[model samples]
Target chain A: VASSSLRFDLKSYLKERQRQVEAALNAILPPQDPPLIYESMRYSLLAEGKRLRPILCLASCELAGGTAAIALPTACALEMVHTMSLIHDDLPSMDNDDFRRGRPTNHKVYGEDIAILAGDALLTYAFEAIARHTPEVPADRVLKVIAALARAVGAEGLVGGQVVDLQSEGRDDVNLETLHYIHTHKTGALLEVSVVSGAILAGASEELQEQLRTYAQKIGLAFQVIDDILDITAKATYPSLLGLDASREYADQLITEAKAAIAAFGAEADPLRAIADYITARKHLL
Target chain B: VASSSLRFDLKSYLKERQRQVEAALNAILPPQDPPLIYESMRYSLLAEGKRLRPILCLASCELAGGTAAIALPTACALEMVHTMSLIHDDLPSMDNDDFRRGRPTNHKVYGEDIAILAGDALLTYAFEAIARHTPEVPADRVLKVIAALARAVGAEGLVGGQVVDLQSEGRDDVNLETLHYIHTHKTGALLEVSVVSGAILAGASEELQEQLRTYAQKIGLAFQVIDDILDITAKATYPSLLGLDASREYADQLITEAKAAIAAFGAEADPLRAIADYITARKHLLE
Candidate 1:
């Protein structure tokens, strides 16, 4: 399995998908009237990142027998939603981080007012982009995609997670269950949808979607576990709760389980397998 | 025509729809986990305002040959979106109004962070409510309604208008055209959609939808014109641009044109026609 994964050039594949996702993102949101709002939206959206969510969406689409073209609009929408969350999370009233992607946060560049408006616009525009731009997909499928993205963003997912995280700040006894809830809702929800939405677009069977969901859930947690390991925060991270050695072992265990979930797939799922590998390996590299 | 309009009791109709809309709103958003966010959301959403947007939606659906039951979810969604705009608009960084509907604004009570989150949740949930809760409507029609709504909320509509309105503050050279752009985009866009979405959900013909659009656009602008008259703001409002008397005349003119757009419909359109009349009548009662 390791040999087969090694044969797949993860670097080139990422580069190609990154290029495609970026081009589509640029095309979908060009400059328009009311230059200030568009500029503010573009400022945060076009910022450099790994494009991990979109790449996963495209890869899952291909794995499920759908072409990347059919998934591109939704992929773009996913990035828009992701960027919106980042923008809001970095606001003064929230995380208050002054930097993101190696530059001033959205509120730093544009004032907090425009930053808020931009995030609102981006979130609203994500659905608009999908509803208007997606072609060749059935209307019902598109509706499901919209529903999935909304649930992931609204109270049941990202917002709910953030509320709890905000409430749980500076507590003495933040347990594993609370930590797990935060991680799954805040980060895991979006990542799971990134993979599942693609399979949904391709109209994958129930069993395959179930398997892909299992694979995604494992990797999603692993991705966050690696983040906790690298940042080494004061918050209730896996490292703080489980110790460094145990944390690493746990991450490895998750990666192994994630791969096993997708073992039934052939070479088409190589990208996903290598991605699971990248989640752990990248942490070590840093 | 005045006799016909007088025959319909706008008071009772508005009261009944308001009751129905409030009940559905409460049912749709019950208290859940993370009570803070829901409390913040309900603070603004259930505040006592004229459930104008949802009522328009329900009325439009009925007039377009569909029952209000089929349009109730979308009706609730329209209010959610409207409440979201109001909450965000009143943020410290934006309008910064301390009070709304005779109570502290969302941020003033919940703090700015939760207020912002509540607004975002409401906006996102609007789409979810429509997608999940709408019954007896085709997927294509629901998709179209969503598109109309997103466009109304995005750059070309509310946000764009807000950016320009912010830029124009304290400038002495504001003109009617700029004011028109602001009013039509900021307030008028959502109002127009409130009418058209109901028609779309009912599968109204292109011609009837077109007529409803015209009606909605006219009343939308008139709604703002009357607001300009009553509040009489320093901004380039209709009364500020045109004189108060002229602004009154213009609003009446728009209302007449709006009623004309739907003149072909008989008793079914009485609610719409009376709603148009109410837009102007309310202004005078205050004055």
Candidate 2:
């Protein structure tokens, strides 16, 4: 496809993927009748934001020669994990934000205990969803995907990262290393898993996985760096540690590297390339 | 073995199994670098308790002709799930008990937030442990075991039971049906899975699983009845619904029925029979 056509394709691709993701989440997320916990789980899971993680998962799967159907369950599961993290992160004892996406946060609506339960239920259900739902995927590969998902969200991944983020809060002495540690783990771990897991489920080769690993690492860091740039938080951030100008420069370098990592696939990888570009475009005018 | 010797053997068996279980949990649970989340996970997981769930899982797998090595990982993972539930159940929003097993509850020591994260870590790691550590078990059987553990903990299992138990707090008129629902679910679900998952890993026939399921259900309910008789809580319990005398009678029937469920295995099931009689033997002095 031509450059203009590819650019046009990116918009339509994202819109279509988002719709598919929302539909998959709707169909897959259990509507347990106890109402409070299930309702709490659904409330956050169906909350609005850019569905970036699941989108990355599906795009990487398609880029590596896999069907959306094969990757959709894992994609939805990625969203579920991400949503659960957000819910726990917003608790009174955690970030304590009362509002998220312009709506009352999960705990504010459901109470702290129920919000915690809801988060647990979602996290538990995510593994069940992947194991139970992924169609036609080999059992071993499904196992690989499940293990990867657990590692990404568990003690080593989000949980460990969240604790560091929690501890580092209000400490202005936070250096770039600690900042990278927090962002890479707190946010980047899931992003990398989101991208690589799709490829694993689709049976991508080890070499391809290596390339995608670099691709995802760059985009993951860029996404977080952009998030830091777009916000002015007291929390240790890339921009906060490295200074705004250098951070912007750092994010630009990541996007370029992310785009370069997948350039070999040419038009077939245009969606991924476009996504990296999209991340950069959000800050170009800054 | 003679009946007297079998009884003695069971005492030795439980003692040996308990020691083995403690060592297994100690060796299996990782002391990750962050130290706190992992430490919190280990704190409860390695804490003193009956280790009944893991022992039951390992025993059932043995009775079904599998090796301890085949079932040990699932056994340890089962304890992790049980530990996770206890930690979460003791949260301020739930049962809120300050003490468990004669020690400070997880939240009391770890703080509610860290306690919650600890529970999450343990629960998440249970799956990872099962998948990542379980050696020699076929991949499919391991998958079956994983699915079973998830079902036992997710909405259809522990979580579902926990919600109902929470909602029923302080209500005076809870009926026998609801009482059983609370017991069979809150306490019995894990018990059932702990027993059956072992049989599953051992590739027991469906009919044998049915037998084990009945065996587990009876013991599971009896365990709850005994717990209710032992404690006075705000929650409505088996004894609260059935009355003390009736509850004892109920437990007697369950123990007897539990033994009968595995009679076909004969000498091989002597340990289980001794265990059933042990339940009632502990009660005879009180009566």
Candidate 3:
């Protein structure tokens, strides 16, 4: 796993980032009485991930000629929002599956009551963290982060996407266009923000924001196309409407499009090159 | 309904506040392609209310020697947060009520699926409303309002109080201490902000902020005490923790404390006074 190799060889760098983000979450999250919901958010946040979102944020900030200091708060917020959606998605009402990131989903161990509370707690605390913790960032940028996040996660974005996904369940009419909307809004919106927001916060030009958006949109759809392909051909309980072969071709086309979008970025695009290549590395398995 | 009469006489005042608040909500809400959540939010918001929360905010702002212009955004935001809780409380998994404000609750009118989305829409939109739509109010003041409103409604505030209340359901062991925390947090938190946020937004000093908190807390608890009395003796499901008369008397005592707090503000205390009297107006029926 070159990803693992990159992580281990750079352990000092990644580890310090994890530690800083953890402290920032703590400063923002504190310790609630009963310590349940607060603890749950802390638990999963500290659970396991490559810290890719924050690293991406830090990297983009550097690319824009700013330090990691100003980007950490927004980065932590991105991670929190990600975790919040995961908690909700695992609930009995939604996906109804258990075991996420190799642990029982939030609803399983905490029970539905605390599970819902934990998601709510994290969602609310995510803002508190942004507002109170990362003082280095400017107010206008902070507010933009709020607006961006609120739109992405609210009804029109993830929730709307999920609703369509659920409705599309057990139905055979889900076409490529509908799948495009669902994947783009549900999974793609936040990922797009994860890229562009870091650029914006670091004062990147609007053109740069557009570049990240186009790149993220294509890659984001490719990711879901891969997931859809895997579900029907390689995994169990596959989504009903999406068949295997269509998913494969869709995956191939989108990756091609995503890579082509970056031609204008020049050789400084090496990191993004590595990223786009990293995304497609497992395409053959799919 | 003399209090209702007072509200009626001030119909234009309430209407103006509602218009400003609704506009602010629209201004801050996201413009997305699907637009389902926006429609869901508007469905509940455009549904009518007594518009009491914004009135409290604006009335208090006016009494504090400021125009409603100063309180307009906070006034709208207070209503949005209030409506957010209402939308959620009516969900199938929560209070599970099917009717609200004498109409189908949000979920009843919309499907439970959309209802849940509506609640999320309202909740997220509330803070967004504040952060993005503070108009001429200073940025720091807007942030302060956001913090205060967040505390009142978040997990530790109404949501925390709600967790405790849900635990109290169908149990007879509830004591005055626990019940007071419920009322203080569940209902009292938002109402307290209703007056206090507007007052603070209008540049009230810290001393006045604390004083208004006391006034609202007392009245808030008293209002719930009366609620308890109404629940048992007046064909509503009062929490079985306290008996009717005891709840009524306790509410009156809270009113006393509230009046004491209100009087500390000299002539600028009428809006709070009206709220106290408003709670007491129906006290006799509870007996």
Which candidate number has the best lDDT?
1
Residues A1-286, candidate 2: write the lDDT tens digits: 1222233567777788888899999888768666666788889988886788999888889878898899998899899889988887888767789998668999888778678777887888888778777887877878778778778788887887887776676687888887787777778888888988889988999888778888888988898888888886336677657888898899988888887788778566777777777787786856
Candidate 1: residue B270 Cα off by (Å): 1.2
lDDT of each: 0.87, 0.80, 0.69
Candidate 2 segments exceeding 4 Å error: A1-5, A9-11, A232-234, B1-5, B229-235, B243-249, B266-268, B283-287
Evaluate fnat for each of the predicted models and list the values in order: 0.72, 0.38, 0.19
Better of 1 and 2 by TM-score: 1
- For the second chain, the TM-scores of the candidates in order are 0.92, 0.90, 0.83
Q: How close is candidate 2 to the true structure, as a TM-score?
A: 0.92
Query: Comparing 2 and 3 by lDDT, which wins?
Result: 2
Q: Which should have the higher DockQ, number 1 or number 3?
A: 1
lDDT of 1 by residue, A115-216 (tens): 999999999998898788887788888888888889988888888888888888979799999888888888887888888888988998878877887888
> How high a TM-score does candidate 3 get?
0.81
> Which model scores highest in DockQ?
1
DockQ of 2: 0.57
Ranking by lDDT: 1, 2, 3
